[PDB]
Design a protein around this ligand. Structure first.
Ligand SMILES: CC(=O)c1c(C)[nH]c(-c2csc(N3CCNCC3)n2)c1C1CCCC1
Ligand SMILES: CC(=O)c1c(C)[nH]c(-c2csc(N3CCNCC3)n2)c1C1CCCC1
Length: 105
């Protein structure tokens, strides 16, 4: 299970999931809603997957957690146009994450 030293990451993830721009990223990108995603995106990532990995002890370090968060946003800017709703959401959430992270780093 998660080590207590990573509780600040747990909270950051919780706060990201509650964000108004979080809706595209709560669950894995859904093939029922869009085609060709995993054709392009080699390592999908989403907040639910991160939440379970963190809670079960699958992140040894905060940097691995941060790498998966940045992966959510990097995938988003890879697949989506910047002026699409999901693309704009990704830019918002990246700013939110980096501002939360810099309180600690
Ligand atoms: C391709 C992509 O990068 C997406 C991300 C990170 N997210 C969502 C997305 C859009 S709508 C939504 N959801 C609300 C309903 N319940 C399931 C989740 N996710 C997408 C696409 C799926 C449809 C078109 C955009
Ligand atoms: C329900 C669903 O599977 C969706 C798909 C295929 N696409 C969008 C989608 C793309 S953009 C957008 N919104 C802009 C206008 N009003 C607020 C929400 N919803 C959704 C929902 C997720 C919550 C909102 C609808």
């Amino acid at each position: 299970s998660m080590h207590s030293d990573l509780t600040f990451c747990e909270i950051i993830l919780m706060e990201m999931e509650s964000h108004d721009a979080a809706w595209p990223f709560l669950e894995p990108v859904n093939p029922r809603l869009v085609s060709g995603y995993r054709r392009i995106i080699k390592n999908p990532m989403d907040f639910s997957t991160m939440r379970h990995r963190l809670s079960r002890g699958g992140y040894t370090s905060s940097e691995e957690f941060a790498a998966d968060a940045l992966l959510v946003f990097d995938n988003c800017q890879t697949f989506n146009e910047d002026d699409s709703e999901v693309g704009k959401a990704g830019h918002i959430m990246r700013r939110f994450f980096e501002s939360r992270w810099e309180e600690f780093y």
